[PDB]
Amino acid sequence: GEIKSEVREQINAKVAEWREEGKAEIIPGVLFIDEVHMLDIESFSFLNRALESDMAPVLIMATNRG
Amino acid sequence: DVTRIERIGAHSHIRGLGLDDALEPRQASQGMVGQLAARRAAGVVLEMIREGKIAGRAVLIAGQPGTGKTAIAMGMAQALGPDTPFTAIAGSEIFSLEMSKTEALTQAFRRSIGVRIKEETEIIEGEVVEIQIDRPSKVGKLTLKTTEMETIYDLGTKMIESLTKDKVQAGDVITIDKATGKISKLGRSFTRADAMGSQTKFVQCPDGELQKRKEVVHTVSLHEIDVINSRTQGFLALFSGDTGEIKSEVREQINAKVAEWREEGKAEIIPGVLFIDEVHMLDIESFSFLNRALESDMAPVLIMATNRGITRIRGTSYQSPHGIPIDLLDRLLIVSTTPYSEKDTKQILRIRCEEEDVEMSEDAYTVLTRIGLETSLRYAIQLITAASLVCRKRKGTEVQVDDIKRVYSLFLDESRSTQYMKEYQDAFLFN
Amino acid sequence: DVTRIERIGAHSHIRGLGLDDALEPRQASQGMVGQLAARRAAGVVLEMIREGKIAGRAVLIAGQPGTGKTAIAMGMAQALGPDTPFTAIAGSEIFSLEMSKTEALTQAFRRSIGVRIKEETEIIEGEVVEIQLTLKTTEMETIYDLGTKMIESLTKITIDKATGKISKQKRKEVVHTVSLHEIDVINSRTQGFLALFSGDTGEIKSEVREQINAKVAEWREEGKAEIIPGVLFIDEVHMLDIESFSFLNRALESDMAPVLIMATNRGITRIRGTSYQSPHGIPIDLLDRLLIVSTTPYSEKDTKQILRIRCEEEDVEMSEDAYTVLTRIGLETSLRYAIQLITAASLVCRKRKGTEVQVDDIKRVYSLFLDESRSTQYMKEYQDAFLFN
Amino acid sequence: TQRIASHSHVKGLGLDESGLAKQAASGLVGQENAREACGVIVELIKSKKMAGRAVLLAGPPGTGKTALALAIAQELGSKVPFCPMVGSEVYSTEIKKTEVLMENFRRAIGLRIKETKEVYEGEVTELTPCSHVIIGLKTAKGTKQLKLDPSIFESLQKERVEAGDVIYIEANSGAVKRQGRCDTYEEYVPLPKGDVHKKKEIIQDVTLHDLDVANARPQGGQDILSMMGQLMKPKKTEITDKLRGEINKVVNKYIDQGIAELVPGVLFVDEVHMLDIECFTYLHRALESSIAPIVIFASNRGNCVIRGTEDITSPHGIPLDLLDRVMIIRTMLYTPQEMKQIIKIRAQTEGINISEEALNHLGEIGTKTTLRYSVQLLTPANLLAKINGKDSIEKEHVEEISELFYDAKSSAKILA
Amino acid sequence: TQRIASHSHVKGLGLDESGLAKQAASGLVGQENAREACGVIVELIKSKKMAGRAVLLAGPPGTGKTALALAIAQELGSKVPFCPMVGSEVYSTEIKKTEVLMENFRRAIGLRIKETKEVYEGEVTELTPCEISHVIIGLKTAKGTKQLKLDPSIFESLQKERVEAGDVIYIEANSGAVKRQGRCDTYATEFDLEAEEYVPLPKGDVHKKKEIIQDVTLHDLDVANARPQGGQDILSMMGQLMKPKKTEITDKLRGEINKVVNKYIDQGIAELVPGVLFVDEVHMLDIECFTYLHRALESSIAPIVIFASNRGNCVIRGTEDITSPHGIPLDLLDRVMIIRTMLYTPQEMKQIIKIRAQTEGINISEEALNHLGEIGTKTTLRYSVQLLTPANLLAKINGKDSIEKEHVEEISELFYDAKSSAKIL
Amino acid sequence: ESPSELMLTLCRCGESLQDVIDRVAFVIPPVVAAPPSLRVPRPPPLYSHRMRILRQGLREHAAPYFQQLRQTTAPRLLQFPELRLVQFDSGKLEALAILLQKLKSEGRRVLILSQMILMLDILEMFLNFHYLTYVRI
Amino acid sequence: SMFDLIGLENKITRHEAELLSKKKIPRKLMEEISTSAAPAARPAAAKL
Ligand SMILES: Nc1ncnc2c1ncn2[C@@H]1O[C@H](COP(=O)(O)OP(=O)(O)OP(O)(O)=S)[C@@H](O)[C@H]1O
Ligand SMILES: Nc1ncnc2c1ncn2[C@@H]1O[C@H](COP(=O)(O)OP(=O)(O)OP(O)(O)=S)[C@@H](O)[C@H]1O
Ligand SMILES: Nc1ncnc2c1ncn2[C@@H]1O[C@H](COP(=O)(O)OP(=O)(O)OP(O)(O)=S)[C@@H](O)[C@H]1O
Ligand SMILES: Nc1ncnc2c1ncn2[C@@H]1O[C@H](COP(=O)(O)OP(=O)(O)OP(O)(O)=S)[C@@H](O)[C@H]1O
């Protein structure tokens, strides 16, 4: 339930540190939100800024709405 | 003279359903007068409940306010008697922060099915005369005593540990479960009670056989079994109510195990009645669940009461006859209550005055009956006690029409209060 | 300079109500200018709080935005001092996932009443390094018997003469003021005092609250405690529900009720949780229990004096022409906007290697930063580009 | 020294011995008919024969509904449990509104337990065990040596008693407490009745809700695993109806045995209009119950929309079917003379001396704005009078305090 | 290598000494007025004496508001706490949104605390307890051997780590933390095969005291003291088994921590570095959150707050009918300084596209750059910069090392923008 | 009874899930505090006795599981520089690793000559990284 | 304590409770017990 933001910042910093020190290699994956029209405005607003991070995957969304 | 927790309530005078063995409602019997057709229908449904053959039959009691629906329900509960589960809830009680409305309805259903489980235990009880040196792998002797027998038992390691852990002492009455080797100390010897006194309790020596077969019948409900099996210490939820959405798999396992016991003759299923007063307060989701919860083989008889006209179902914009979806109305039989004539209102008031233990003049009865016909039955019932108090303050033995007029002027009914409000409505907040 | 946790906030200049002994408000004093009638009303309310005899009195500070209602509240808090409880919340803070709105308001009410308890301890100890116990001091030398093992830790200071409590030259007396909320959170659990910090208190039961009220009344009668009635300040009270307001109605009728100060800046609006319109977003039944103090919009000279006080609070020197330009701006846009222009213009002058804020600095800051009206106009001009109009 | 509340002047209903209302008595002026109704329902509560009877005090704001309920409470005394409540209190994040209502019903029924409590005290433990425990107790007045159980011995060890540490030990429970370690050999017992064998008749008042919550979870640190129950947050739960029935049965047993007395009390629901339709619908069945208390509702609403319905308007914000089962007491507006009487009563209660012309001007202000506003000006006006060296409130002070503070109507006009 | 994000090109505000914005510098082009205002705000944050000052970045989407906020962050540097936040993050399932806002306020205030660290490290020569008030432990390094009397807590942590003898351990006295980092090197030769790892014995002193600077925020102190993790008493240990939920930290804990921090500042062992809280999509906050921000910005402890909103006359969330300029209540707009971002000319868009191409390592021909600028004028700036990577991929598929116009045309045909998609809808 | 399994992995298709946790478990709280204490002058005897009874009883109940109770609930207050950073910080050690592994397989022995004592300490660390036994002169 | 129903779950069963109710030392026998002398007539072991 609601992993702390500072914990995630620490994870990110240590993963970058691992990458610089030859331990870790980052594999960016794909997040597929099927029926993305079921998200509300708040979720879309978060998605806007969640995509600005360097640890953000490629996002595929599908929707039949018009 | 002495006040108990139960005292004069609204329905305390309904001792049962006043109908013959032919299910013909007597005009006035068991504290219930009038509503002949609805009482006959209630008798038929009561016989259905007593036979316990048909599962998930739903009955709706409909009618105007003050027409006796809860009176008929309480009469059914009083004729049914204890040891047949009659669960009474309001439709509001299912909206809980603990669990979903579906879960609450499921618990209410599981609470209306009663299980009588019998077991044989084969225990040993006796006053302990001696426990001797176990120092050797430890081995010891235990001497047990009834008023007719005493025997000496050779103790294994586990029994020795149990006896030393309970600090079993010479001169106390224990019971030993042979299957489990479980020691229960229930009292101290009859050779003292002789200067003691503490958490201890004093018991006289058992008489008869040291070893006794015993049949104990345990009465539980399906809900109780569910919450006992829900978690390791789940029986505490029978007290706190902290049940939290018992798993469906647990309920299926319990249903299967109960069916096994019933085939084995171990368990006896007593199906009961779930009474939901004010069923119009349920959501369309709850009615949808009731549609299917009734179609289970372990479903009780569902009785619901509603005074609604043609209202919108809660959670929807749809107008349905009793605030209940039409698919659920097809699944039930509707008992309708006719309003009360002057004779019926007078009889009801007489029975209520008998319950209150208040004596009223005949002119007072006429005036109060007219007041009830004008205003409402419940208002007249309340005026009964109010006028009794006003009479007592007057140092009179019989309530007169003057006292009824006094309490009528002191206490308003809905219509007169609404009128006084209406002429002053600019002084009241929000219209 | 060293940056402390307390920095230059909006109301840092306010040291209290600038009030005479007759409660008459000085034109400018203790960081507050103008609002003579409102300041006088706050002074009489403050005398009511200090007297502390009448329980559950409610005062509402009403006026246009930026008229100093929160400033009057902070001045009242500064005048009241740290020894009487002053609980400040926003109307939004009662909407909690831990507790109901009723519980949040109850806790806020019980955080404003303080019980003062003075205890006599026993402390004589001093300069000792020896081991068994004998003690020596510049004026004292003593021996003490002992029949317990606590001395082992004491070896490696001062002790209680009564119970022998050990901790690293006379009886001395200690005063502790404890709020009712602290008392019932400490006594709600085995380690309930932790919930005073974590907030994991979760709807203290009415039973314990009743018992603690009874015990506090007993202590008051027996002289062991005295009640220090405080004041609860609810800023932006229009965020409360109709349920919250109805609770406040009868919460104020306890003898353990603090003095309630509420601030609101809206006219006849909808009460939250209802479709009804009421003068302050507050139901009329609660307004019935309130004394309402209204704040007048500031004049030109009052605005200039406020700007002067804020400038000397922020330690920025401006020219007189800059003061007149900024006063015109404040009268044209808002007081808060000018207050912020002060800091921005000080920064612009600093980049310039200047020492005094000139009119050109204020013009530059006015160009860089917009008020609501100018931004709204530029928005209207680009209406289509913006989202969801 | 205690503080003056809004209802601190309400000492009772102020009725004569025939039940009629004195014009002004025990802090109440006017509302004679409502007061007489409150008196008859006080007699109803003291009769303790009727359960789940409901009374609604309906009238404009400020007409003394809450004052009348508090007067009823005063007329009953602290013997009878008076549970005050607001309709907003049913909305809890922990339990459902129905559980909150049921609990408040539980705590409006009181139980009075009579016990003859025996205890053994003294300088104590002049002996510890001379199969048995022998302890000598000396308390100035004398000394007794008594024989205890071995179980009392284990409890005594648990309490780490030593020879010379005053203790409690009760014959009715076997519970033991070492009250002190008076360093004479840190507290020693007094000597009014400083006997070793102490027994006196005790009465403790407990509500049925207290019994329910006591039986809701284990008793805490005594048991192996209930010790970890003390580390939990004290969440309130939906006490099952079966537990209530069982507690009722045991309470009835002990009422029959004559050691307990049933004192049913009053549940006062102020701002009943804040309950939603679910709460009222439950209240139907809660009032049908024979184990329910006497319930007093108060509403100032004119034709409000019932909460939780969004469309349905009923007279007092209360559903019609609930109004059908309650008795209505009508509170009316106050004449200016009654307002003057009330202002004088409040001034006297607050220790405020008021001149005659000041009282008349304040009564005029109240007739213009409202009774509450005029009652509120008293303390600030007294403070102003004290500032200006006076001990009586004069017309100038009330004028100045009226100019400093506004009523709802004046503020609304400024806002419009 | 490092992954390229949508803002990786912004390295600052590109302002000269006098604060005037260079047309293109530090990865930013245009928005000179907004960049200059942001430079003023950077100076405000560096001044460090003003608390609770809020700025609002207002302009249509695509105008660079988040870019300017991150440019401010770059200007400040990693030393100053920059807490980014979105309005949608307040709606937590565990704590009230007011608590989330206050926590974000508290983690935008940073502390640099100099702490003396007491270290015991060495080979365990002996471990002798005394009834259990003591443990006598001998520690051996290259410098020498010492035996120390340590608390029962350290002994019982040593039992947790299971250190017996010949084990190299690291004890931090402050936290009571024991680390068994292996067995001594001298015991490697004992056996051909042993189931542990050998570490050389420490070469320093047994008892080392070290001064270190710790970077923490006020929120770190609040959370540590509201969910205590130090201390070895059983009561706190059993509380550690609870699910670590976020709790509504009370104002009393924050006041106590304020007192502690003030004491540290007086003692010279701490320095306050108040930072900035960046709430993007502030329009997502409901009326309750804005009305709380009213109070949260009056606090003398508050950080600098930056808001960004692209909405024109949106209804305030939670109000259901109240239209305010930027989705933000007017009473809050009275507390902020508004920095407006303007739309871009075709030339500025072309410059931005070239900068993004440079950052993504993509060679684009002049024809392709002009065509992509034309597309961006027709569609949007965001659409054009997104075409660059797919166009480069197609160019590599064709075997060319630069993006020609045909690749841009192909990618334009394969993908659509919101306007074309809306047309076909 | 009920079923159960350990064959369940997390993301790797591999080892015993405590090695996984150890591999990825590195965060330390920025601040660690002992629980706040209630500073009461002369606490009441009943309260102190109750607290003592509770603490004593909770212990001797967790005593059978005290070691487990502590492995859990023990925060990570320290994270050390991992041993692999040696030999990654230096290219000399990176080449020496290959050289020494080859020399080990070939059976030869080695003596490493370095002027710096401190680099000898670093070499001790590096040799332990490769499980190579040595003597220091 | 007589209203402590939850505690009794750890202690006894209903058959045990019915047993106890039937077997509780009657009042008369209590005074008989407290009057009479100790009947210490144990025949001692025989091993026949
Ligand atoms: N024979 C009777 N039939 C109906 N009500 C009776 C009868 N005798 C007494 N009453 C009383 O009449 C009142 C009417 O209430 P009920 O109708 O039984 O309950 P209810 O839940 O309100 O159902 P309603 O009013 O029809 S919606 C109660 O106080 C009953 O105790
Ligand atoms: N106490 C007051 N005295 C005089 N005018 C007031 C007062 N309170 C509010 N107003 C007026 O109300 C206007 C708007 O107030 P706000 O608090 O910003 O929003 P509002 O009053 O709720 O209005 P809306 O549009 O109905 S939400 C102010 O600009 C004032 O003109
Ligand atoms: N008849 C009365 N005699 C004396 N004081 C009264 C009387 N009625 C009301 N008061 C007092 O006048 C003030 C306002 O009356 P309240 O009792 O608080 O309001 P209420 O009528 O009880 O409840 P509301 O306002 O109608 S919802 C309080 O201080 C009361 O104690
Ligand atoms: N003046 C600028 N110079 C350089 N890059 C810019 C400029 N303005 C915007 N960008 C960038 O162009 C892309 C889109 O701008 P963003 O700032 O991410 O979105 P946005 O339009 O600022 O968000 P909002 O809040 O709706 S304005 C990002 O890669 C930014 O870095």
Author numbering:
A (entry chain D): 266 to 331
B (entry chain F): 15 to 150, 156 to 212, 216 to 453
C (entry chain B): 15 to 146, 161 to 184, 193 to 204, 233 to 453
D (entry chain A): 12 to 141, 155 to 209, 218 to 448
E (entry chain C): 12 to 142, 154 to 447
F (entry chain G): 1808 to 1944
G (entry chain G): 1411 to 1458
Report text from the authors:
TIP60 can modify nucleosomes through covalent and noncovalent mechanisms by using its histone acetyltransferase (HAT) module and its E1A binding protein P400 (EP400) chromatin remodeler subunit, respectively. TIP60 consists of five modules, including TINTIN, HAT, TRRAP, ARP, and BASE, each with distinct functions.
We also reasoned that unresolved, flexibly attached density present in the endogenously purified TIP60 complex could be reducing the accuracy of our image alignments and therefore the final resolution of our structure. The 2.6-Å cryo-EM density of the reconstituted P400 subcomplex allowed us to visualize distinct features concerning the arrangement of subunits around the hexameric AAA-ATPase ring of the TIP60 complex. The ATP-dependent motor and the insertion domain of EP400 together with the hexameric AAA-ATPase constitute most of the BASE module of the TIP60 complex below the ARP module. Our structure shows that a fragment of the EP400 insertion domain (EP400_Loop) buds out of the hexameric ATPases ring and forms a series of interactions with the VPS72 C terminus and DMAP1 in the ARP module that positions it distinctly within TIP60. The EP400_Loop is situated on the periphery of the interaction surface between the ARP and the BASE modules, whereas the VPS72 C terminus occupies a central position at the interface of the ARP and BASE modules (top, and D, left). Specifically, E1474 and K1457 in the EP400_Loop form salt bridges with R314 and D307 in the VPS72 C terminus, respectively; the main chain of V1467 in the EP400_Loop forms a hydrogen bond with K91 of DMAP1 (top); and A1460, L1463, and F1464 of the EP400_Loop establish hydrophobic interactions with a cleft between DMAP1 and VPS72 C terminus (bottom). By contrast, in the TIP60 complex, the ARP module’s position is fixed by the P400_Loop and VPS72 C terminus, which are themselves anchored around the hexameric AAA-ATPase ring.
